[PDB]
């Protein structure tokens, strides 16, 4: 059996929670591969779908994004991407278009999910109404909270459906994730999800 796997690049401003996010997947963390030349840790994240396992090889930087764009080698052969920002830091949202631009320059029209991280933090700065870059670009958006595992599987499920070309692909079980370090208030999640729905009707 030929294994189904995709290079996923995980980009966004430093401090947005990319590493925290990718690390939730325990096996992906244990089996991560260090790429010395590029200063990348590739986390092989397997998800079990109704059509068998799929593996996202997630490329997590070693913080270099704080000092400039990433090198071509980081992006090359990427098959999908997550662009992350921090909903408590508007500037990270403002930089989202730049990340998308750098990404598409090397990778063209690969499937990309936009993720607004740290929604567990009560004082949210970038709210649903303001989040529109994905609309302008054919991208899917999700709120996430890396620290609580909130919506962890969402970006990967959406990407898997796009990559495999199966709108009915499902994850049959969640991968083993690091136990939440903060609680994501369910009422707050419900509100945020509602706010996003409302926003999509504008």
């Amino acid at each position: 059996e030929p294994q189904v796997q995709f290079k996923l690049v995980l980009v966004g401003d430093g401090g947005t929670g990319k590493t925290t996010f990718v690390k939730r997947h325990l096996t992906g963390e244990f089996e991560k591969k260090y790429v010395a030349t590029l200063g990348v840790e590739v986390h092989p994240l397997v998800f079990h779908t109704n059509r068998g396992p799929i593996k996202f090889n997630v490329w997590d930087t070693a913080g270099q994004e704080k000092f400039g764009g990433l090198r071509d080698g980081y992006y090359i052969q990427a098959q999908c991407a997550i662009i992350m920002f921090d909903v408590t830091s508007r500037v990270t949202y403002k930089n989202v278009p730049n990340w998308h631009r750098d990404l598409v320059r090397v990778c063209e029209n690969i499937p990309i999910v936009l993720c607004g991280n740290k929604v567990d933090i009560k004082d949210r700065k970038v709210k649903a109404k303001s989040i529109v870059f994905h609309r302008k670009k054919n991208l899917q958006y999700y709120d996430i909270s890396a620290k609580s595992n909130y919506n962890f599987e969402k970006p990967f499920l959406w990407l898997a459906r796009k990559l495999i070309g199966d709108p009915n692909l499902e994850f049959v079980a969640m991968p083993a994730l690091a136990p939440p370090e903060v609680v994501m208030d369910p009422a707050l999640a419900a509100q945020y999800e509602h706010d996003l729905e409302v926003a999509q009707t504008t």
Binding site: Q5, P44, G73, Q77
Partner: peptide, 27 residues
């Protein structure tokens, strides 16, 4: 045919003698 880089997991062209992404030589 194509080969997978053992360092970074990128799939490379049959004619590549080193990984297009991370430069690791093909084993």
């Amino acid at each position: 045919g194509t080969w997978d880089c053992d360092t970074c997991l990128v799939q490379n062209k049959p004619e590549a003698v080193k990984c297009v992404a991370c430069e690791t030589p093909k084993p």
